[PDB]
Amino acid sequence: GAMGSMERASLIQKAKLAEQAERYEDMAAFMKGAVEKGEELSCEERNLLSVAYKNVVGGQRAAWRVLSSIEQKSGPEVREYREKVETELQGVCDTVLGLLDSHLIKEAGDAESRVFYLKMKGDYYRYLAEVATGDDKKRIIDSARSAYQEAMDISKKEMPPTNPIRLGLALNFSVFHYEIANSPEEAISLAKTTFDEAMADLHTLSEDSYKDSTLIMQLLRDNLTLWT
Amino acid sequence: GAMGSMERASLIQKAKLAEQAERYEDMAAFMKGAVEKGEELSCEERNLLSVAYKNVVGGQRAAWRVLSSIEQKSGPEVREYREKVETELQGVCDTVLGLLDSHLIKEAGDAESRVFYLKMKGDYYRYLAEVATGDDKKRIIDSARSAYQEAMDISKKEMPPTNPIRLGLALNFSVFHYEIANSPEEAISLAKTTFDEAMADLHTLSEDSYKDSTLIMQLLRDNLTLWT
Amino acid sequence: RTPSLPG
Amino acid sequence: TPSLPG
Ligand SMILES: *N1CCC[C@@H]1[C@@H](c1ccccc1)c1cccc(C)c1
Ligand SMILES: *N1CCC[C@@H]1[C@@H](c1ccccc1)c1cccc(C)c1
Ligand SMILES: [Cl-]
Ligand SMILES: [Cl-]
Ligand code: NA
Ligand code: NA
Ligand code: NA
Ligand code: NA
């Protein structure tokens, strides 16, 4: 890796500088280098990793959607350029999935980190599914579901129902069901069950945790209103 | 080069799609390929080329300023990363200056294109000057001045004082005087005489040309009232 | 810095 | 449908 000769601590420092400079491709490359050192990530570090790649893939997804919209309205140039952006998006998703499989998920030292990474795996397969077709899409969808489901199983056993990571996983898994897997019934059931089981415990939470949890509950609610 | 097998018209079309998707690195690469076909750019195509590279170097300049400020307030990591961004910025400026010198700047042009490209040459040397130090800075500063001055001489002989390209050149040359060349009196004098000479000829213009010209006049006045 | 032409 | 914004 291009970052193999740089100290782990220097890579983390430069990731934070890149964030300040809004250089998210650099930030992602620095965080990739830090992951490839082979050590576990702290909570702050895996948030840096997530933010960096979300900004990168988010820009590619938005560009892909612009180009796909022009293509659908409509020579080969629009399709060609959409395919170029698509291939770059797939490359970034493959890179993130590679970090998670080699070896962030298996090395995660606590349930919260494990769930965080398995959710991320589901998310990046989901981003692949948005642009995939045919048999590849079907394989990708099954991979996304399996990752999300493993995260669900762990979060149910190890995390309280108001935990923000558990809630965020349920949010994204239910979006997967509705938007990708054409399973609106599963999306609604998952969001509803998650919402109810969190609501039961809101009174046990501090002021800040209550705000955190109801924030994501409202995200579940917005999706339920769209869906129901 | 990676664009050599693509049709000129397809490169221009994809530059326009890249602009819609806000993919300015791609846009610049497509326009570079179009320039390398060896045909003169139209007015519209010159604007595509300029917008593309403006946005690329704009992001690099903004990041450089962030990192330089952090470095000034302050291990080698900040300097290393500022130097990385600086080198990439210089690489883009060198690319643009290379396109101008190898393909676009000619003796036998229409005044509009000759002034456009010499102004651009001045701008990209000015961006190099922003990050240069010492005597190296001195030669870069004189290269910017020489390009702006040649553009000014042509613009005063061959274009009316309301011409928007002429006005934009005067605006940027005045900024060069104020910010780079330590000549605020010359900056102010140039902005004032340019504004006043355009004002006096607005009565010759249609509604459309009037809007084009007065928008740049307003920028000149903004800088004058900032500076005085 | 003083603003330059925005295009 | 929107996903988690972070
Ligand atoms: N600025 C220099 C050349 C390209 C850009 C101008 C432009 C862009 C796109 C179409 C037409 C012109 C431009 C844009 C905005 C303001 C000015 C003063 C110039
Ligand atoms: N989203 C998942 C991991 C990173 C991002 C969360 C986050 C980003 C930066 C610092 C802390 C956390 C995040 C951000 C905003 C809202 C939520 C629900 C999560
Ligand atoms: Cl392409
Ligand atoms: Cl670096
Ligand atoms: Na075409
Ligand atoms: Na060719
Ligand atoms: Na003329
Ligand atoms: Na003033």
Side-chain angles (χ1 to χ4, degrees):
Chain A
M3 301 301 176
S5 69
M6 206 187 304
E7 291 280 10
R8 190 183 186 284
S10 299
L11 288 161
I12 297 299
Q13 183 177 3
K14 290 182 184 180
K16 292 175 184 167
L17 295 171
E19 185 180 30
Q20 292 182 259
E22 299 178 88
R23 294 270 297 197
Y24 291 102
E25 294 182 7
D26 288 350
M27 188 189 179
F30 290 139
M31 287 311 300
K32 174 174 187 289
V35 169
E36 286 173 352
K37 300 302 179 182
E39 305 174 26
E40 271 186 274
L41 306 190
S42 69
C43 177
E44 176 180 6
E45 290 167 347
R46 64 181 152 75
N47 286 335
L48 289 171
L49 174 73
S50 179
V51 163
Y53 277 108
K54 185 57 184 294
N55 272 272
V56 175
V57 79
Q60 296 170 317
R61 291 165 79 207
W64 186 91
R65 289 166 174 178
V66 166
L67 296 173
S68 187
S69 183
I70 294 166
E71 185 181 12
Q72 234 62 48
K73 296 161 205 155
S74 76
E77 289 84 357
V78 179
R79 173 181 57 74
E80 287 171 351
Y81 186 48
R82 189 264 302 161
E83 288 173 346
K84 178 199 176 70
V85 174
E86 185 172 301
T87 299
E88 296 183 9
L89 183 154
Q90 292 166 329
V92 177
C93 293
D94 285 348
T95 291
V96 172
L97 293 164
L99 298 173
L100 297 167
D101 283 327
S102 305
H103 299 276
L104 285 172
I105 287 166
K106 67 174 65 59
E107 284 295 312
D110 62 359
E112 189 149 292
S113 302
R114 191 156 284 275
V115 171
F116 182 102
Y117 293 133
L118 284 162
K119 174 190 159 297
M120 195 166 182
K121 180 175 174 172
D123 292 331
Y124 278 83
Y125 274 118
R126 175 160 57 83
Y127 306 147
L128 288 174
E130 293 173 343
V131 308
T133 59
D135 299 329
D136 180 55
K137 183 175 190 193
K138 291 177 168 73
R139 286 187 293 265
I140 290 165
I141 289 175
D142 284 350
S143 294
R145 183 184 295 103
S146 304
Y148 282 135
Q149 187 58 53
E150 181 176 5
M152 288 292 302
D153 295 342
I154 295 165
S155 66
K156 298 250 191 61
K157 296 180 179 187
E158 303 286 350
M159 294 155 72
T162 53
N163 178 285
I165 302 299
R166 177 172 165 181
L167 295 175
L169 161 65
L171 173 70
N172 280 10
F173 195 14
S174 71
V175 169
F176 166 83
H177 284 314
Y178 194 93
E179 291 291 339
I180 304 297
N182 198 24
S183 196
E185 301 92 347
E186 295 181 279
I188 295 166
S189 298
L190 175 53
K192 170 56 171 172
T193 291
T194 303
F195 180 102
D196 281 11
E197 295 182 346
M199 190 179 180
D201 291 353
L202 284 178
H203 70 275
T204 69
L205 305 180
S206 64
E207 187 175 327
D208 291 358
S209 292
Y210 176 93
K211 292 259 152 290
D212 294 351
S213 300
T214 54
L215 186 150
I216 305 179
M217 287 178 70
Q218 183 58 49
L219 299 181
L220 292 169
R221 173 54 52 195
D222 295 330
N223 295 0
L224 282 167
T225 301
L226 298 171
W227 300 343
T228 68
Chain B
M3 300 306 175
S5 66
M6 209 188 306
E7 290 276 15
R8 188 185 188 282
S10 297
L11 289 161
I12 298 297
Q13 182 178 353
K14 289 179 183 180
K16 291 173 185 175
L17 295 169
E19 187 176 21
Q20 293 177 265
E22 298 176 77
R23 296 265 300 191
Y24 294 105
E25 177 177 77
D26 287 351
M27 188 187 180
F30 290 136
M31 288 310 301
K32 174 164 187 292
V35 168
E36 287 166 341
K37 302 299 179 185
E39 304 294 327
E40 295 185 358
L41 300 188
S42 68
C43 181
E44 182 178 7
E45 295 164 347
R46 292 192 296 272
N47 290 333
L48 291 168
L49 175 75
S50 175
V51 164
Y53 278 110
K54 161 181 156 65
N55 275 270
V56 173
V57 79
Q60 296 172 318
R61 292 163 74 205
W64 186 93
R65 287 174 192 199
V66 168
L67 297 171
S68 178
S69 293
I70 295 167
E71 181 180 19
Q72 290 306 325
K73 287 203 179 71
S74 78
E77 289 85 357
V78 179
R79 171 187 59 72
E80 286 169 353
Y81 184 46
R82 188 268 303 156
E83 288 177 354
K84 174 189 157 69
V85 174
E86 183 172 304
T87 298
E88 295 178 6
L89 188 157
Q90 293 168 324
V92 175
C93 296
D94 287 351
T95 290
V96 171
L97 291 165
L99 288 174
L100 292 166
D101 284 332
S102 292
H103 296 285
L104 298 169
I105 290 170
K106 300 183 181 304
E107 313 155 44
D110 294 346
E112 292 61 40
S113 66
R114 283 180 281 140
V115 172
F116 184 101
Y117 294 131
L118 285 162
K119 172 192 159 296
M120 191 165 190
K121 180 171 182 173
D123 294 331
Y124 280 81
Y125 273 116
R126 173 161 58 84
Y127 307 149
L128 288 174
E130 290 179 341
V131 307
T133 70
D135 295 331
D136 175 57
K137 198 177 178 111
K138 279 163 36 58
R139 247 176 284 262
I140 292 167
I141 287 174
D142 205 62
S143 288
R145 184 192 315 275
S146 180
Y148 283 133
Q149 188 63 59
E150 185 171 4
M152 288 286 294
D153 295 342
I154 297 162
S155 75
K156 287 180 166 160
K157 178 187 167 178
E158 306 192 43
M159 297 172 148
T162 52
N163 175 281
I165 292 172
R166 173 169 172 182
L167 290 175
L169 163 64
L171 179 73
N172 281 8
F173 194 18
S174 172
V175 166
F176 167 85
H177 286 310
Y178 192 93
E179 294 288 343
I180 306 294
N182 192 26
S183 300
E185 287 191 334
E186 187 70 18
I188 289 161
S189 289
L190 175 56
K192 189 155 191 318
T193 54
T194 301
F195 182 96
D196 289 346
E197 296 179 9
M199 178 61 58
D201 275 7
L202 288 175
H203 72 271
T204 67
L205 302 183
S206 66
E207 192 173 279
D208 287 336
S209 297
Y210 172 92
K211 191 55 164 298
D212 293 343
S213 292
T214 59
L215 282 175
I216 304 174
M217 293 175 67
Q218 289 167 32
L219 300 176
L220 283 160
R221 180 162 186 289
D222 289 335
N223 287 354
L224 268 174
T225 62
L226 173 68
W227 293 339
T228 64
Chain C
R1 283 204 192 276
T2 304
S4 61
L5 196 70
Chain D
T1 311
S3 61
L4 192 73

